[PDB]
Design a protein around this ligand. Sequence first.
Ligand SMILES: [Cl-]
Length: 95
Amino acid sequence: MTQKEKNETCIHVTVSGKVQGVFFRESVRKKAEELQLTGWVKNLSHGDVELVACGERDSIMILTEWLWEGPPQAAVSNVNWEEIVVEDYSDFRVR
Ligand SMILES: [Cl-]
């Protein structure tokens, strides 16, 4: 494997709770960028926040812990993640 291939993976996450009207999408993108992760995030209508995050595993695991807190005024009730088949992204975007 290349070093990037060896040292990186991807996860898929859903985040439940009070996650609307608190700029959750933007906060995930900003946090991900600070952790040098790529992927995407959206707010499912009437539902959970959903994201894919790819990059180094330490960063991934810092993100998954942070998702229990979220941005100010967020009230997260659950974070459900799994590692997935790797997908290629050049940046982290809101969707
Ligand atoms: Cl974006």
